[PDB]
Subunit: 284 residues, 6 copies
Amino acid sequence: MLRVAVPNKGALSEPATEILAEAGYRRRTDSKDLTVIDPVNNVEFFFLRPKDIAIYVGSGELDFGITGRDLVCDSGAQVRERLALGFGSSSFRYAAPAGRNWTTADLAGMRIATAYPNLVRKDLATKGIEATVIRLDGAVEISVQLGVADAIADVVGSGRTLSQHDLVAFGEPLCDSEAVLIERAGTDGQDQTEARDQLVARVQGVVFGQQYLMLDYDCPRSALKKATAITPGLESPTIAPLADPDWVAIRALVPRRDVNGIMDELAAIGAKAILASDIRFCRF
Amino acid sequence: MLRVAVPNKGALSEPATEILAEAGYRRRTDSKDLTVIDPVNNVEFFFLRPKDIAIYVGSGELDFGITGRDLVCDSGAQVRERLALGFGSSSFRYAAPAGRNWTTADLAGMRIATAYPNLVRKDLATKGIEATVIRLDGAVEISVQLGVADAIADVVGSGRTLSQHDLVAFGEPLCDSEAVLIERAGTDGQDQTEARDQLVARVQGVVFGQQYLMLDYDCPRSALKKATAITPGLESPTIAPLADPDWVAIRALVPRRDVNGIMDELAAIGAKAILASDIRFCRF
Amino acid sequence: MLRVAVPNKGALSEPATEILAEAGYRRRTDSKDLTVIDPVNNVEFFFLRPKDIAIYVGSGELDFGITGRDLVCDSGAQVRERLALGFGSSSFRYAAPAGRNWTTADLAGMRIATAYPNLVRKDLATKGIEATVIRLDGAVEISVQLGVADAIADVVGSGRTLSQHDLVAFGEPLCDSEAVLIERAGTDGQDQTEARDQLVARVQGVVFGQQYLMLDYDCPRSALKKATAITPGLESPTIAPLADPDWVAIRALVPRRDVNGIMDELAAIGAKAILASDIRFCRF
Amino acid sequence: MLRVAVPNKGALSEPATEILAEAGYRRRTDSKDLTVIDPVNNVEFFFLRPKDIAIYVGSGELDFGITGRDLVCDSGAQVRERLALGFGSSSFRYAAPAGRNWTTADLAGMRIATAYPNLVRKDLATKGIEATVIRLDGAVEISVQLGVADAIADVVGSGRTLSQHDLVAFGEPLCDSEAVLIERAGTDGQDQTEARDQLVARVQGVVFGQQYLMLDYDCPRSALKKATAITPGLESPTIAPLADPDWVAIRALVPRRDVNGIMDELAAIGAKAILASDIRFCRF
Amino acid sequence: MLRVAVPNKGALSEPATEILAEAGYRRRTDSKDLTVIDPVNNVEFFFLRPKDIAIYVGSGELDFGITGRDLVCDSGAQVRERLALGFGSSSFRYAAPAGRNWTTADLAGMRIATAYPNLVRKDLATKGIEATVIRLDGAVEISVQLGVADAIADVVGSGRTLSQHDLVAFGEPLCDSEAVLIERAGTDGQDQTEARDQLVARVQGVVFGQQYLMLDYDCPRSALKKATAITPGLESPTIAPLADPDWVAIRALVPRRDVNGIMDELAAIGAKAILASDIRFCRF
Amino acid sequence: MLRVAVPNKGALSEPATEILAEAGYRRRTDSKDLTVIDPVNNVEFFFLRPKDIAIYVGSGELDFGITGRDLVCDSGAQVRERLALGFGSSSFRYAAPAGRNWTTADLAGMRIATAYPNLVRKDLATKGIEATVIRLDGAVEISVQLGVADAIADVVGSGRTLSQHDLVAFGEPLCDSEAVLIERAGTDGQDQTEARDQLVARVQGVVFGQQYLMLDYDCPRSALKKATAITPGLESPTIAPLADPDWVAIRALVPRRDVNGIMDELAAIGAKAILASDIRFCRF
Ligand SMILES: N[C@@H](Cc1c[nH]c[nH+]1)C(=O)O
Ligand SMILES: N[C@@H](Cc1c[nH]c[nH+]1)C(=O)O
Ligand SMILES: N[C@@H](Cc1c[nH]c[nH+]1)C(=O)O
Ligand SMILES: N[C@@H](Cc1c[nH]c[nH+]1)C(=O)O
Ligand SMILES: N[C@@H](Cc1c[nH]c[nH+]1)C(=O)O
Ligand SMILES: N[C@@H](Cc1c[nH]c[nH+]1)C(=O)O
């Protein structure tokens, strides 16, 4: 029996449930209750505060959690990052009032407000800089106008929050917010290593599969050699005859980020009815 | 022209609309209005109170409805259950205050509160027991604390509601809450038998299809004989050559509940890029 | 870099985002902010008032928009309609109090209330009729009861709004509400013609693909000649052997509106496990 | 310790909480939980389904409830109606399809759908009429179109629901929906009679007070005799001098429904600064 | 029977209903339906789009409406403004991109976007300036960035919307957004003049009363002469004895905006228990 | 110009805005924006995270804030508590799994989870006990079941959260959650001492006034001496004649918690029309 911690609210909650569903786990019956028991898969899911998930995995009984990479950097927990999940990512920056040409060295002896004080204190220490780091519970950007701090450190999205308070980011970026699957450190006893390996392989199938599309298309046999070079697939393309003997159908996996260039090339050699379909799971 | 009753709210409403959409019927334009006319399929959908749907099919002009099996047991309507739809199921139990070792025979002459009084009265009669059954409109669990009844009878999910009121279930379970497609009894006149048969076949295609996944995978020809035994499919697996002549691609339907064991076996004989896809409709 | 205007609310908003997602564009991160930048596709999406989108494309810097055909008729903008998108369509009618046998000629010299005054004034002019057209901001049906107008002109859905105010539609219908992709008129400079052509081809792939389903089915070889005539596909059906040598699997695109007749015919010649799957993109 | 049942949702819920607050009882801390304990007043409030409240008072341990008068007529409970609360009232009527001149005698042997079957069966019996009364859970108006019943019986507001289904009300009205304070029948033991009397007196203070306004106004002494006749108050008006010796200020309770006529009369005899204030509690 | 138009949504809707309630009219039973009939006061209220209310009063059968003063300036309707209601007010300004020193004369021949084109065209004409005014449906501030206009004209609150798009207001302000009670022009026939006068007097009682508070306080008789000068009231203060013969209680209306200075002065001459209460209606 | 911090969400937010409104400050225009400027009172209100308000007052530029007393204990800020506001109060307790007879001394060397780690660490130190205090972001009760802690420390309301996780509170209570007005420590410069004193006096007027009701009642002169003893008021009751010379009207402040006993006594000596009204502000 495995126990898995899932974010109960915020930007990571829906895509976390989505990826767990595509790996074949029971979806949350209703957003009101806070556990979901999966008897067929032998897993129980707990919906918890995002900022706490790393502590639950690292000091508690949870085998796995899904949380942001910055929240693991801030927690001080000793957990293993098994997979980057491909969503939720965003930079983490120092920021200060526009129009003063701030640089990292200006932070020495200043007051820096953040919701991630342990992350920031370790970053400054590595750079050899001492400052006064002030923990706040949320929305730190207004703390400069209101006199609590000289600079801040926070997740930045597209900079909307910074510009709305006349702040400019500076310095080298910190530990980012990408969603990760974390695992409790420790070997335990074989029979539990196996159940843990199974969950990781299943989530990995979604993480990998979601990077590709399946292309299906009709192709003249005369253009078949060129098509094979254009879509080599993961092993080699599938080739099947059509009723018309001068034609075949070709099936091949292609990366999402390559798809439109690939289709233009296929169209130019005579390919017709070029179909593209979502992949949600693939065990390579 | 067929008329079909659909639950307008509650746990059965979204999965009911989902299954009707996958059978190819027009989805509800907006959740505010209460009918949806499907001119191409020649069907009209009415969104009604769940507890009333069985009466509308059994005494009204509706040809079909989707409701819970317990609501058909409680209604006294004479309708045909054509299909179990595979969602919404839950046990229906007697329950009484924890710590008293209640058994079914203790109900004789007691006061039993329930939202399904006809269901309960028929269950007790079959067992030869007489008691006083008290109809309530909803949420019956609090009626024991408040002195209206000695025991209750209600749908139980995972027992959250019972434990939150210090109640323990006992006795043989009653008619459960699984969602069913019900049909009005009666033969009418041939031309309407045909239209009715068509809807049932279409919903049955979703009910059946949703129990499987399509597996696609690349396979060495040397492992082909073993693969065929591992995934026999519904008739026999599809086999197509890859460009590489030592390899093929195999397609086969497999039951959802079998999928992960099947993939482990395929991986161990040399299969690569094992893909798994949702099935939403299959006419066997 | 392309700029595309998307309806920010109303009946057209979700299906507009849906079609853009299926063409492979970044979906709106959250419904609160009003732009979405797509760096990989080199497109920026702006979420605007539906009634304004035609003016933004026709007089502004936007390259494309998605809006209703009636809103283009009302705007007076000079834009190109590139594609009908297949949703949101509804008739646009004159309407007047029930029980008076209104005809189009009765409008001469009357007061007509509408949210689309330029559309209505051009329609009347073409028919040679002069009347007083009164602009209102919304919900015009009540304006007759309240004495502001003698008749109205409005989008009609299924006539719910008309019957709820005792109004009956009459006359030839006007410019309808179907969703369209519009483009700014003008040739600019080659390098921008190409980027524009790419977006249109991608949306066209969704518009075309969404009219079909992929049929997959197992078929006895003895029935193969008949099956080929029943499902000719877009080019010709794919044919692949099963393990069992007396059988094959057939793949073919078929129109959504044909699917159930097609399956009945296939069942009657011996086809088994007839599968039907959504198509979301097809470049013919 | 008293236990009081309060409607947990619907049209009666907010005005019920409002009247209990004005009688000085602790207001519901948050709409999520379902009890509120009032330690200073020695009362506990339970928020329950409206249709069940009469059964909880009549067969349970609750001392009081607030519910509709029709729900008491339908419940069959033996409870005392202590006060009409002055909100929620509405007529209860038979109704049938427009354009057929239905009368009460046409109901004999017909099918009548209603959410209040016991109320309707007793009403028909008193009139000497036999019919088939069909219990439904809610929204009964559509049951005629859908073939379940020939006529209905339901609360009517302003007839919106009737006209929206082409129904016309007929016959003598039934037990109406006005909100009432009900009490469990029975004398118990003196010390509990006293606590019960206290709650009734406190709610009665709100019921009575809410029918009046306090008028305050400045008045010339020369017009004082006429003013006294215009506002006699509940006992006799309060009269106090102003600094200016030719003037006084007058205070008097007047009925809400009389207020504007009263003010016109006072203005015409020389009264100035006529103030009118809400009364929320008055023990006569 | 009077008909009154009330804003159905937006910033003016709740305070409009609030002021009508304090004048003693029936409050909207539920926000879903769109009329409210007041049988005791002989008035019917219609909840309409704010931008349309002036047209309904000026060309329709409505006797009164509540809307913004700018919406009357934009409508071109011939209505009487009877009262300023004391809420909803905000300036209406031209605005253009920051950092260019725009002045009113720079508008000549430019493109100006606004939701109030008739208001703007009349303002420019009075100043002798010709420009191209572009009607938009809402949120006009983004139209400059997007190339549709050179400048805008819009209601400004505290400038949040302007600064969020880098716009600066300039020039003389236009017709503002303060809420007003408007009346249809025309004398009709005596018996309807009277009913109209009554509504205006009742709303005026709220408009006037809401500018004051009632002060009540205990005062030594030795300080009575000074107190009388500090709170003269609307006519002269009320003076009543306390049980203690060296003391009195004083009652007087004072303006809300004066209240705190007044209390400081009273405290400094020996006044105790200085009470201050809301006034919701006063007929002077 | 004063700056005041107000809770932006949670149980303290609405009653905080309510008390500020009754002291005569501008109410939040809309819950979306996060500042409100009051030009007439010369105060600006900032709506912030509750857990941060003490830090904003203690280290920032804010003059005042409203927050929970426990949040001040947890913050470590050096602020002055000027007033207890009379809402939001609740006990703060250690808690551990039911059925083990936990006492305070059992905490030595254990793991204690809490959202208020500084509060807990100072409480344990004062008692001479060392333990490991684990910071969590919220909802700490589940941390025992999930293995992160042996005991917790949290605000308890009525114990719903404790019993829902099988926890029992024990030990002496900690710093409670009552809402307080806090002020920045420091004298600054006279002209700002005065503006600060004014706000405190105004909030104090609400805090004091809200503990009383105004009683108004008609009284026979023969019972006047007894009535004066029953309602002495804050100074002495107001006495004014009625028109009827055998009667008077009496006005007196009485404590809310005394009101019903007081009215029973007045009724028994002949008092009639006993009226009771809310007090929202009183400067003693
Ligand atoms: N043979 C193709 C398609 C495929 C992958 N898996 C199964 N089929 C490829 O290797 O990409
Ligand atoms: N031939 C495989 C896959 C398939 C089913 N239907 C069409 N193809 C099977 O029978 O399972
Ligand atoms: N060969 C089939 C199926 C197919 C289309 N595209 C790829 N395969 C057809 O032409 O319809
Ligand atoms: N004396 C007035 C006002 C009043 C009632 N109660 C107290 N004062 C009346 O009897 O109506
Ligand atoms: N006499 C005081 C209070 C009052 C007004 N109206 C009635 N009483 C004044 O004139 O202001
Ligand atoms: N004189 C009464 C009522 C009152 C207070 N303030 C003004 N009037 C009292 O002192 O309680």
